[PDB]
């Protein structure tokens, strides 16, 4: 599943909803610390839509438990990421993924 370790609290009231556009900064790492993706390098927020299957399952599941202004470390098991196949490029089979995520806005 998804483990959430809070670095900075959100308001604890305002969470992502169906029909909303989620606006976040994120950085994705393997367990060994290596980066595979980021929004922070381009220095601009990344947007994705709840329920629209635009990101891996674990990432959305984690974000949906975050409130406005929260920054957290999401630990995501392979079965809700890329699983036994991994993905072309950095991500190997059975990769538990680490995401540094900040929930900036909901549009």
Author numbering: 1 to 107
Sentences from the study reporting this entry:
The human genome encodes two homologous 12 kDa FK506-binding proteins, FKBP12 and FKBP12.6, which differ at 18 residue positions. The primary known physiological function of FKBP12.6 involves its role in regulating the RyR2 isoform of ryanodine receptor Ca2+ channels in cardiac muscle, pancreatic β islets and the central nervous system. Similarly, both FKBP12 and FKBP12.6 can bind the immunosuppressant rapamycin to form an inhibitory ternary complex with the protein kinase mTOR (mammalian target of rapamycin), which plays a major role in regulating cell growth and cancer progression. X-ray structures at 1.70 and 1.90 Å resolution from P21 and P3121 crystal forms are reported for an unligated cysteine-free variant of FKBP12.6 which exhibit a notable diversity of conformations.
